[PDB]
Design an enzyme around this catalytic site. Structure first.
Site, mmCIF file in Angstrom:
data_model
loop_
_atom_site.group_PDB
_atom_site.id
_atom_site.type_symbol
_atom_site.label_atom_id
_atom_site.label_comp_id
_atom_site.label_asym_id
_atom_site.label_seq_id
_atom_site.Cartn_x
_atom_site.Cartn_y
_atom_site.Cartn_z
ATOM 1 N N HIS A 137 0.841 -1.212 0.000
ATOM 2 C CA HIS A 137 0.000 0.000 0.000
ATOM 3 C C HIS A 137 0.850 1.224 0.000
ATOM 4 C CE1 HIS A 137 -2.901 -2.983 1.414
ATOM 5 N NE2 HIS A 137 -3.853 -2.170 0.979
ATOM 6 N N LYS B 272 -0.305 4.396 4.686
ATOM 7 C CA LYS B 272 -0.984 3.338 5.412
ATOM 8 C C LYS B 272 -0.225 3.042 6.666
ATOM 9 C CE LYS B 272 -4.225 0.219 4.815
ATOM 10 N NZ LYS B 272 -4.314 -0.296 6.174
#
Ligand SMILES: NC(=O)c1ccc[n+]([C@@H]2O[C@H](COP(=O)([O-])OP(=O)(O)OC[C@H]3O[C@@H](n4cnc5c(O)ncnc54)[C@H](O)[C@@H]3O)[C@@H](O)[C@H]2O)c1
Ligand SMILES: NC(=O)c1ccc[n+]([C@@H]2O[C@H](COP(=O)([O-])OP(=O)(O)OC[C@H]3O[C@@H](n4cnc5c(O)ncnc54)[C@H](O)[C@@H]3O)[C@@H](O)[C@H]2O)c1
Ligand SMILES: NC(=O)c1ccc[n+]([C@@H]2O[C@H](COP(=O)([O-])OP(=O)(O)OC[C@H]3O[C@@H](n4cnc5c(O)ncnc54)[C@H](O)[C@@H]3O)[C@@H](O)[C@H]2O)c1
Ligand SMILES: NC(=O)c1ccc[n+]([C@@H]2O[C@H](COP(=O)([O-])OP(=O)(O)OC[C@H]3O[C@@H](n4cnc5c(O)ncnc54)[C@H](O)[C@@H]3O)[C@@H](O)[C@H]2O)c1
Lengths: 272, 272, 272, 272
Positions: free
Chosen positions: C158, C162
């Protein structure tokens, strides 16, 4: 492995035989029954499983079915269609269970095989990869679900000697998807994209084929939408994949003597 | 960003303008000079950078170069060839530095551009992606080294609306490699593989093209041998890639007023 | 789309609202019912679907449920828990069907939702991605089959913002597999590998977590053996994935008014 | 191959010897000089290159350097540190050029090697993969360019028996990048991400490590930004990669008798 189902491996110094040995060894619940090979063999009488490295195994390569017909339960055959038929007729005889991965029979050879099953339990299949067979099953689950919304593309890579494009696993993949959609592969397949091709037609299946190096086999089906894509990829690193597939089947055979099965059966893909 | 080089972004509510704003904002050492746009604009006079979300920025979209000719140093133009030429003649005039990413000029439009450079420092380029330009440079290092031993394959994926296969970055890739090998792309390119194709011919470059979904652009060059392969892949996720490329250039311009450059120049790919 | 099921999209200038609009538009058999939004909205009364670009659509953003309660069948809500509850009580009232993708309710908010279902048909789910939900289902088919032989690894990437590793879809994946094996994730999970770690323990599930750039979300489960591996990867490119998921559900709702469903229900993952 | 530089392959029935044979055979401009092996060998006196399959080659495995000191030009040694030292002292003697890929010398063993070079031309290296060495060079070009803007992540996968995480090629990669940035790996490396970890710290290098199956070695460096990422991946499929690397070097040696080189030298990575 040493365990409750004993096996003999037909073509012992075959690229297939070498790897089945290691698998037989490896896999829990099977035990290396016998390790036959051609008469003219150099590896004869002598050995064990020491093409599977694995030093001393205590079972010695041979040349007679009679010599050892007592030393195994299931006959694993990755040979030449000629041998399999001999093997066949012998196993039917002593009610030996087989696992045939040999390829290239004509109609007559298959029929023989269908026929023996009558008396003998047989796993006969053209691809013993467990990953490949699962994948094909998964592709078809996926398609039921996303198939209609998505652009579905199939991408395979193989070594620089592979001679027809796409590969057969790839068509196989095209066909499971196609069939999941009630559709027909020949109707929506596109194998080339060169020059001006225009925007992608909906519902078609595109194939992209890479040929290079020593790549054993890599197959990915992409289900793409706007905002996401789902990919199911299989990679083969060695011929071992087939090997464990057959041995696994060898084990699955234990306890049957009905006729004729394949990897869906072994794998129960059909209740998955 | 707020810093030592101030910028005006031509087509302000363009898919390009929106993203350049965020980049101008973002990137250290540049500061948002002005944010022009078409006269008939709705976004006029009002704004700031609030297509780049980014709330209140204090610089207000406009319509006159004169209105703001004093409020920026470098003119970033991602517009239409028509506007750029107006922009052009103005910047030459006030000795404004430009960064043109506008595409589709004919010969006359380019020449105009070549000409202005005489007096004005200009970055003019058809692909402002920094990743793409580096990659092309790397591909050519790689080829000098492995090019002759290896099978070199190029695989690109784009969305379902892309209309010519292969993409131009892909050809571009084919050509850097080809040229690294003193060879010629047209001589060794293979864009299709269908049916029986026979074993792969040595030295050829194969292209594989995937079209699906919303894929912005993914390009990989594979240098494959026996026992290994080396892959250099670029993935574009958004048009932001071009954006930072131009802004970066905008910053690179600071301090020049010679003529005509591109991303090799900005990036110094040539001493890399 | 314009078709047999009409819809209203709660948080109209939400990152969610913008994309649901395009989907409503896009998807066959649904038609844009209404496009509500907060009172203090700027987008009020005016619009259509022109955050979904899509120019003029004829349905105008609003602020009253009463204003339009007549202009749609299913209420799609991606809002804030506060609004949903208002929305809730209204829809129960007029027997409006909902699709709630709003997150962050406490126990009391869920219960309210469970309760309304009594009278109202509701799709309520924490992940409306269709790809993600299919994948989770496929992972569990795969595990039944290969789970015991294979090394199963989960790799997610990600963006750089994140904040917990692994992601929740990743755990979710760990858990479907784990549960397919009758096993327990907490018992066999390994989230780190640093230094000397020793050979991989059989049956454990390893997690590898990549954080960089702007990556929306990429999740792959690898079922690896000797000689092959099978990989099932999902990539999210945009929030559109959730959008089509809800709209699709909106359409699935048509004809129900029983209680409470999710994406397994919509998708029929359970008979797959 | 049969050609202008003749070679002898030390540890002939080694996993290394078997593959170097095929390479010697394969590669243009080298010819199989000799094929030594341990005295106690079974493969002795007999053979040719028929571990490299390759049937009858006319050069027969041996046990004496004197027996064949006349039958080759460059000594390729992938053995045990003990043998190499014997080999060493012999080659210095007859001015035989070597290519040492043997690992595990202590300081004294290296010094011996440094010393012989005085009289003998030696390629001595801990990784003979050509792909890996190029990659390391490319990573460092890339970093000069994108290194500062980008999130740089390193992801490696190996088989289930690999015992330290990350692998050494991976650290090696971390270090070329780090060093390209004037920075220090130990200062910015992050090898684990578990639980709440918070947003990614700028400039750090993250490592993600996958252990499964039979994976020989796969290493990718990702340079990610907003809107794009650039990835440079190396995949090893077999030990053949090292093999061609040494043979290639064997050929590069021809014509030198200065001292001490490595793959940068052979490969000219340094002028790349
Ligand atoms: N079904 C699958 O999943 C799959 C996968 C790989 C290979 N195959 C098939 O496996 C078979 C074996 O291929 P391979 O590559 O292992 O071949 P190969 O290395 O050529 O070895 C042939 C083996 O069979 C023995 N042989 C040949 N004729 C024989 C005879 O008349 N009686 C007894 N032994 C005989 C050889 O001495 C050796 O053991 C082929 O028919 C191939 O097409 C099938
Ligand atoms: N060089 C590259 O790396 C690269 C990358 C992406 C796009 N492009 C080029 O960027 C340009 C912009 O594309 P876009 O997708 O941002 O287009 P688009 O969204 O259509 O926007 C056009 C923009 O230019 C303004 N405009 C049009 N004619 C104008 C005029 O006469 N004077 C002033 N403003 C004018 C519009 O009002 C709007 O700001 C195109 O020429 C495209 O081909 C180049
Ligand atoms: N379930 C899933 O698949 C999934 C996926 C993405 C987002 N979400 C959830 O979707 C929701 C929307 O997120 P978003 O990112 O679209 O948020 P965001 O852009 O912040 O927009 C909030 C939207 O709701 C409106 N709003 C806020 N409070 C309201 C109220 O009291 N009454 C009416 N309208 C109200 C806003 O004006 C705007 O339309 C969040 O609760 C998020 O966690 C769920
Ligand atoms: N530098 C690299 O790129 C790289 C790559 C792979 C392996 N290696 C190194 O290659 C060497 C060979 O590994 P291998 O896996 O091929 O090993 P292995 O299969 O164990 O074989 C050892 C070989 O050396 C022979 N041998 C052992 N001691 C000897 C002695 O005193 N004199 C002569 N022959 C002797 C053996 O009989 C056999 O030929 C090791 O030191 C390994 O660490 C290096």
């Amino acid at each position: 492995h040493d365990a409750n189902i004993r096996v003999a491996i037909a073509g012992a110094g075959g690229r297939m035989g070498r790897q089945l040995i290691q698998a037989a060894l490896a896999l829990e619940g099977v035990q290396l029954g016998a390790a036959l090979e051609r008469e003219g063999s150099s590896l004869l009488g002598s050995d064990a499983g020491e093409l599977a490295g694995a030093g001393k195994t205590g079972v010695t390569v041979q040349s007679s079915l009679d010599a050892v017909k007592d030393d195994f339960d299931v006959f694993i055959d990755f040979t030449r269609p000629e041998g399999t038929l001999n093997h066949l007729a012998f196993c039917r005889q002593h009610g030996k269970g087989m696992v045939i991965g040999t390829t290239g029979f004509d109609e007559a050879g298959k029929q023989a095989i269908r026929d023996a099953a009558a008396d003998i339990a047989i796993v006969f299949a053209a691809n013993f990869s467990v990953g490949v067979n699962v994948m094909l099953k998964l592709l078809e689950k996926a398609a039921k679900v996303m198939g209609d919304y998505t652009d579905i593309e199939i991408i395979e890579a193989h070594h620089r000697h592979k001679v027809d494009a796409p590969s057969g696993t790839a068509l196989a993949m095209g066909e499971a998807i196609a069939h999941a959609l009630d559709k027909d592969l020949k109707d929506c397949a596109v194998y080339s994209r060169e020059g001006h091709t225009g925007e992608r037609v909906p519902g078609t299946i595109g194939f992209a084929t890479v040929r290079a190096g020593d790549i054993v086999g890599e197959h990915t089906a992409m289900f793409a939408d706007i905002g996401e894509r789902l990919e199911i990829t299989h990679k083969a690193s060695s011929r071992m994949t087939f090997a464990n597939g057959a041995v696994r089947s060898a084990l699955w055979l234990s306890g049957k003597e009905s006729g004729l099965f394949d990897m869906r059966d072994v794998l129960d893909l059909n209740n998955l």
